[PDB]
Subunit: 414 residues, 2 copies
């Protein structure tokens, strides 16, 4: 019907980004891909099958929340959340268009669970603002909210999302013991020091980072401890290799065949080693590690004959105290909600969204990353030469994007 | 360590059936053939070598799928799938034993790929129930699963298995042109009518069968259109004559050496023709035709189509066809013939899809056959006429 608004847009989905044309009527949102687009043609159909929205229609009545989102460090994207708990994300040309879209959409605000007013102002508000005006921190302390729910709140507000592997949500490793036969959730030694970054846990390697920070000499390259992030598409694809369409996506992006078993996520205990040994590995976990068994198993069908030489990915090997996936996730989420984590989580938050994210305290905390990572870092619009901008966007996706800082004061303990 | 359950059973291998004892402990499944058995001692050594399970051990921790199976039409077998994609099949004395074996193995159900619950009940569930309760059809319609994958799915819950060639998986011929210099996957004529059996493809030969049906006259064996089956242990061996056990077994089958060059798989084009004019060849294809290049060499070879240079090519083009949009919009029809409502009954009659009655589930109860020699005699009859996959649905299969 009445097309109240129309604008070029970009569908931001788990494994697909496609240029299309958003159109907003008086009751729905429509999106059609540019099936003629060169880049879009080279997209595997299998992948397109898992991608919703390419020709979607969203009922205004179904809208429940509208979040301001940044695509590749640029505050020009939006993410709408549907009543059926699903969500869609489009990236527009300018923050200016976003505003038009936000004002031409229902006044769902940012939802209602966070305790923020249902106003278009909120949808556009900033991360630090949203945090400030929310009651979640209290409820979290008051135990009305679980550690998992709280960490999801922070990540959502910080702009993290399941629709962009470059800004996936971020969760901390909670346990350090993945060797033992049993796991005693009351024995401190089994828990990770939630006050230190991954790169600071092992003093042996920690030295390499402090040393490298000290003996720094360069131009336009502020000193940094890690050239590797704790959250990136690459990382995310590795953790979700056993799930479509990530699997296929990776494969297509890998000459059609998997990667050497010793490099692909194969062992939960082995990953933790690498995250303590490797100088380039400072990875942090993902939400799933606390609720999605699938992620740890080969869900392929049967009688599909492949083990001839054809590389194949089998079940992730769990720690002895974890018989089957359902077990690992159960126990892990239990540890995440344990009392130990509860009384330290604020410190980890400080490193990720807190006052130790960037600055004097960030350097004293051994928590400094490549400057091109932090918010504000770059302005793709400034780059005028396409081949130049692209190369830049390519780098952002390679280094990763630090979550938006939510507070510049020490986060309150639970 | 301690044996929780022990019972007589038969290993059902790619081309071997050996009696032995199956011991279920508390953490593993064991199987030791009875080497003192006569039949066993008669089996060729080369064949035994390429046969695994005669002295096997399987870890519970490795179990992933436990499907109920049928052997020679009798619902008394079982097939276990391992985490490394391996599988082993056993045949027991009766369903009651199968049930015990199931309640003694890990609760893995039928796996977690077809959307079914991981409950021992599924492992005993009926083929029709598995179909109904699965979620593979929708995923298929959604294109999240390929035609190959869906077909393989249907076969698996239908009871088909790479472990018993008499019930080998069933895949349809997709292309009909194997002699043109090039194959346009956009020219309808280059394809096969999936709503029709292989026998009803040739207009002329078709009428022949219809006549045979109407003008039956016997009343000692209900009417049937074909006396050949689309899937047989022999056809399978034939397609895979250049690889063994198969090769070696075949040589033992033909009592000595190979088969007559003219009546042997030597060219896909020729074989296809044979399956169009020859009144006794309504063969259908097998998975291999869509992924196993090695199948078309010798280590003379199979004469590949013009558009098919090397073996690797025939497989890719053919696989592309199986996945082409032409196949997609009409593939459901084929399913209606093989596992659908047109598999049997009046509907199968119009379809020109009726096979020997001794080929359908429920056709015969080997247990009632008291005379030992008559039983063995009956079984061989079954291995010759082929076994029709179980019926999955009785309604029309929705299109993709």
């Amino acid at each position: 019907g009445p097309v109240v608004l129309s604008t070029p847009a970009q569908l931001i989905a788990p494994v697909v980004v496609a240029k299309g044309t958003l159109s907003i009527t008086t009751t729905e949102i429509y999106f059609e891909v540019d099936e003629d687009d060169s880049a879009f043609k080279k997209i595997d159909t299998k992948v397109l099958a898992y991608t919703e929205g390419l020709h979607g229609k969203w009922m205004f009545s179904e809208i429940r929340a509208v979040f301001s989102r940044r695509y590749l460090l640029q505050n020009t994207a939006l993410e709408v959340f549907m009543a059926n708990r699903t969500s869609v994300m489009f990236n527009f040309p300018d923050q200016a268009t976003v505003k038009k879209v936000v004002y031409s959409l229902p006044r769902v605000g940012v939802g209602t669970s966070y305790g923020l007013p249902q106003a278009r102002r909120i949808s556009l508000a900033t991360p630090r603002q949203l945090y400030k005006s929310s009651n979640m921190t209290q409820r979290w302390q008051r135990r009305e909210i679980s550690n998992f729910e709280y960490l999801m709140f922070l990540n959502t507000i910080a702009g993290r999302t399941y629709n962009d592997l470059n800004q996936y949500p971020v969760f901390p490793w909670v346990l350090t013991n993945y060797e033992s036969e049993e796991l005693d959730l009351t024995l401190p030694g089994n828990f990770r020091d939630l006050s230190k970054p991954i790169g600071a846990l092992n003093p042996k390697r920690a030295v390499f980072y402090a040393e490298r920070y000290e003996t720094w000499e360069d131009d336009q390259s502020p000193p940094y401890h890690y050239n590797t992030h704790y959250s990136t598409a690459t990382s995310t694809l590795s953790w979700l290799v056993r799930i479509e369409p990530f699997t296929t996506f990776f494969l297509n992006a890998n000459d059609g065949k998997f990667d050497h078993p010793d490099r692909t996520f194969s062992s939960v205990a082995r990953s933790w080693r690498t995250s303590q040994r490797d100088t380039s590995d400072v990875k942090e976990l993902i939400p799933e590690f606390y609720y999605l068994p699938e992620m740890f198993v080969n869900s392929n069908g049967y009688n599909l004959g492949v083990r001839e030489d054809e590389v194949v990915v089998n079940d992730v090997d769990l720690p002895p105290w974890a018989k089957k996936p359902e077990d690992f996730v159960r126990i892990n989420r239990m540890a995440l909600e344990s009392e130990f984590v509860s009384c330290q989580l604020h410190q980890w938050i400080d490193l990720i969204f807190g006052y130790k994210q960037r600055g004097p305290e960030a350097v004293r905390a051994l928590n400094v990353f490549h400057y091109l990572t932090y918010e504000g870092s770059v302005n793709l619009d400034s780059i005028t030469d396409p081949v130049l901008r692209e190369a830049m966007e390519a780098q952002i996706q390679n280094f990763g994007q630090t979550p938006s800082q939510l507070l510049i004061e020490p986060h309150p303990p639970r």
